[PDB]
Structure 1
Amino acid sequence: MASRILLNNGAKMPILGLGTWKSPPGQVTEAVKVAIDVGYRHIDCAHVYQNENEVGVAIQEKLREQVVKREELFIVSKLWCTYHEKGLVKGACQKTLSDLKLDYLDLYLIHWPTGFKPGKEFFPLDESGNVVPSDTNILDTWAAMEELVDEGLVKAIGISNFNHLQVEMILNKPGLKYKPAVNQIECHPYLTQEKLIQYCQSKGIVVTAYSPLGSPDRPWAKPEDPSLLEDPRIKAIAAKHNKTTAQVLIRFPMQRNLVVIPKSVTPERIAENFKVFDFELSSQDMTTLLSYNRNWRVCALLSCTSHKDYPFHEEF
């Protein structure tokens, strides 16, 4: 297991990164410092997470301490839905750069294919509770992302939560200049994504798996929901390998040639989650884990099911 995967822009991306959604602003600076200290070189960020300034403090301190060089880090962020208008994309990227205290991002993703009305609110609502869409086409948003590469603000661009027809729409865009480097999608043993992964990989697009532990801290968790970390079948595979269940859940996507971005603000877990380059799941283990698929999503963007670009009506 090599530590990085080659992207279609010629850069190498670390296959294991630190997630930062829900990481409290008072804890995420230390989390990122610890992560870098214990070997992480890839941090997954987003403007909508509201903690990029604090993530940036950690990155900057480790650069200043010369724990790492900038060229060794792979920093990812995402364009929020209220900034899909072509005239807002650069400013959104620049705000993220300012907060992260960087002069470029390694990868910048369209966070969702759905554009929303611009404004202060991340989920602008009509008086009846529906999210108010933007009329900006995702192909036009893509062209705006391409400009960021050409202006030196980002080294690579990609997409997130795009279904295969939406990926196809970009790949078939008239005058396409840069293909997406990455599609970041939810993926774990309860949402195994065989079809979409195969499609993306066949096109040279690297897939990043989010919520690989099943996001137990997701705000809308219900007591009766399935729980990967507590699944006795996964615990058994972990026990066989003398690893934790979380370590198996992280190793699983790695062996599918995916990038994976487990989130933690707990120093012991941050270190645990990185210690996954010292064992191998068998083919049988892999197929067994795949067999647990139930098409269960942490992130279904339920407020946007009527949006013309809602991604999860299609089978994949």
Structure 2
Amino acid sequence: MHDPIPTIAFPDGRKVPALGQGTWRMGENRAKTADEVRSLQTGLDLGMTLIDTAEMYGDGAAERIVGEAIKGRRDEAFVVSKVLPSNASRAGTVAACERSLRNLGIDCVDLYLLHWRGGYPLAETVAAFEELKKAGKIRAWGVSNFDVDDMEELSAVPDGGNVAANQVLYNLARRGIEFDLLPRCRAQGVPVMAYSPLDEGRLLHDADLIHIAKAHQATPAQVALAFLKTCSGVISIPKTGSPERARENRDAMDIHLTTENLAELDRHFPPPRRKTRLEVI
């Protein structure tokens, strides 16, 4: 009785469901470990096939959780990880990718991202990313927290037009990218991965969200994700953690936001009317 999840195409032609799973802060409580693992399994079985992680998340701890979650079902998952910019030199990126593969317990990531803009020339990192693609260790590369000038700089370097995604902060409370960055990415066929789709929980106290949630017998969290579902070229990345959470996130896709719902959300969560600096968490 659930409706299918819309899918978002990457430049290379692969498709993933528009609702994925994040792992920030997994791996830190040994009491939570079995729950975290199982929420990610649950998520995959519910069709939330993208799993997002990073080397920084507990220094490989989140990667190891993901690695356990996908045992015997590597093919059910689209696995994303990241390189910290302090590691994003030519040799360092390769070394980072290799530790990531070991932690994840797999031969190849689906998508590997530069975590934010750092001090190594973009062209070195892209070269390392392309050497890794050619080696069968990653399927695709992208970036994260890149503003519109960082994207321009990126295009300018060799192979820089191969960027597969930009992961940036986007939710009802943080809509600044609508003004410039989100349209550029869409016009370019580059998906945006919306991290912190519930603003880390800060959103969930908003009265308008709560009101609309009552109108649909839903949670505020679910109404916040149903919003992002109506945004084309966007893949939302809610953190799972608990199997109940995962099912909640999944069912958010069943919500039909009315025409009146969307105008109401815009009134209470106003789209940007001018360029704003990219917000980062």
Inter-partner Cα distance in structure 2 for 1:277 and 1:294:
22
* Amino acid of the structure 2 residue aligned with 1:181: A
2:173 is aligned with 1:190 = yes
State the match for 1:248 in structure 2: 223
Q: Does 1:166 align with 2:170?
A: no
> What is the SS of the residue equivalent to 1:103?
coil
The match for 2:11 is 8
Q: Distance in 1 between matches of 2:237 and 2:44?
A: 14
d(CA) in 2 for partners of 1:236 and 1:38? 27
8 Å Cα contact 1:23/1:264 also seen in 2? no
Secondary structure of 1:140's match?
helix
Residue 22 (str. 1) matches residue 33 (str. 2): no
1:262 — aligned with what? 238
How do residues 169-248 of structure 1 correspond to structure 2 at under 5 angstroms? 169-173=153-157, 175-176=158-159, 178-192=161-175, 193-195=177-179, 196-216=181-201, 227-248=202-223
Match in the other structure for 1:128: none
- 2:92 counterpart residue number: 88
Q: Structure 1's 209 and 177: CA in aligned 2 closer, same or farther, altered over 3 A?
A: closer
Whole-Å separation in 1 of the counterparts to 2:24 and 2:187:
29
TM-score, normalised on structure 1?
A: 0.77
Q: Which amino acid in 2 is paired with 1:110?
A: L
In structure 2, list runs of 5 or more residues that go unmatched.
none
**Distance of aligned partners of 1:140 and 1:282 in 2 relative to their CA distance in 1, 3 Å threshold:** farther
Question: After alignment, is 103-112 or 284-293 more displaced?
Answer: 284-293
How far apart are residue 293 of structure 1 and its match? 4.6
Query: 2:76 maps to what in 1?
Result: 72
Alpha-carbon RMSD across the aligned residues, in angstroms, is 2.2
Please name the residue that 1:130 is paired with.
Answer: none
Contact 1:14 1:74 in 2 (8 A): no
Give SS of 1:252's match. helix
- By how many angstroms is 1:54 displaced? 2.0
Instruction: Identify if the C-alpha distance between structure 1 residues 79 and 230 changes in structure 2 by more than 3 Å, giving closer, same or farther.
Output: same
In the other structure, the counterpart of 2:111 is 107
Indicate conservation of the 8 Å contact 1:146/1:177, yes or no: no
Indicate if the aligned counterparts of 1:43 and 1:74 stay in contact, CA closer than 8 A: yes
Query: What is the alpha-carbon distance in structure 2 between the residues aligned to residue 203 and residue 138 of structure 1?
Result: 19
Q: Which residue of 1 aligns with 2:39?
A: 31
- Deviation string, structure 1 residues 137-158 (Cα, Å, up to 9, x no partner): 1232122112211111111111
Number of aligned residue pairs: 262
Q: 1:8 to 1:254 in 2, by over 3 A?
A: same
Name the TM-score, length of structure 2 as normaliser.
0.85
The structure in which a higher percent of residues are helix is 2
Quick one: distance in 2 between partners of 1:286 and 1:114? Answer: 37
Q: Cα 1:287–1:76, aligned 2, differ >3 Å: closer, same or farther?
A: farther
- Percent identity, aligned pairs only, is 33
Q: Verify: 1:59 aligned to 2:70, yes or no.
A: yes
Distance 1:164 1:288, change over 3 A: farther
